[PDB]
């Protein structure tokens, strides 16, 4: 509760979605953080970090809650997969292509390692994928990521693949 304020978030529109990362950390006051992700048409909550509290507001405005400890920590290389399509295939089948709102902080590792494991499960090739993120930044995704697609296989998830 505050309001006010002109947060201009920013929009990732991909082959055929839509994502909304916070600039900064999460709002101090939320108020005016819920308006931000419901003016720019995304249907979805930057839950997406080391969140801890009950979704009242956006839970009340219909917002999907989207809270994945995306924030450092996490599973390992597997288990968080389950929520990255299922967040996806959800934001997107319960609303019309609009925006999912989540939380980061400045990229780097996360960055092109969660966007790949999606990217990959929407239906392009782990490699191709890799040297793409990895191209527009030294070992971007490389580590138990690289070797985890390697042997890891697509499950036709997020469309058909390869």
């Known amino acids: 509760m505050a309001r ?6 920013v929009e990732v529109s991909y082959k055929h979605m839509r994502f909304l990362i916070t600039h900064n950390p999460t709002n101090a006051t939320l108020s005016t953080f819920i308006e931000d992700l419901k003016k720019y048409g995304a249907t979805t909550v930057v839950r997406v970090c080391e969140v801890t509290y009950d979704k009242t507001p956006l839970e009340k405005d219909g917002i999907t809650v989207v809270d994945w400890p995306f ?7 597997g288990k968080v997969v389950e929520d990255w399509l ?18 980061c902080v400045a990229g780097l590792g996360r960055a092109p390692v969660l966007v790949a494991l999606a990217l990959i499960e929407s239906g392009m090739k782990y490699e191709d994928a890799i040297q793409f993120i990895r191209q527009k930044r030294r070992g971007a995704i490389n580590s138990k990521q690289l070797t985890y697609l390697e042997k890891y296989r697509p499950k036709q998830r997020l469309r058909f693949k390869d």
Do not use: I, Q
């Open 4 to 9: 006010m304020n002109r947060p201009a978030p």
């Open 71 to 77: 924030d450092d920590g996490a599973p390992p290389p």
């Open 86 to 103: 299922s967040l996806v295939k959800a934001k997107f089948c319960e609303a019309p292509g609009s925006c999912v709102a989540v939380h």
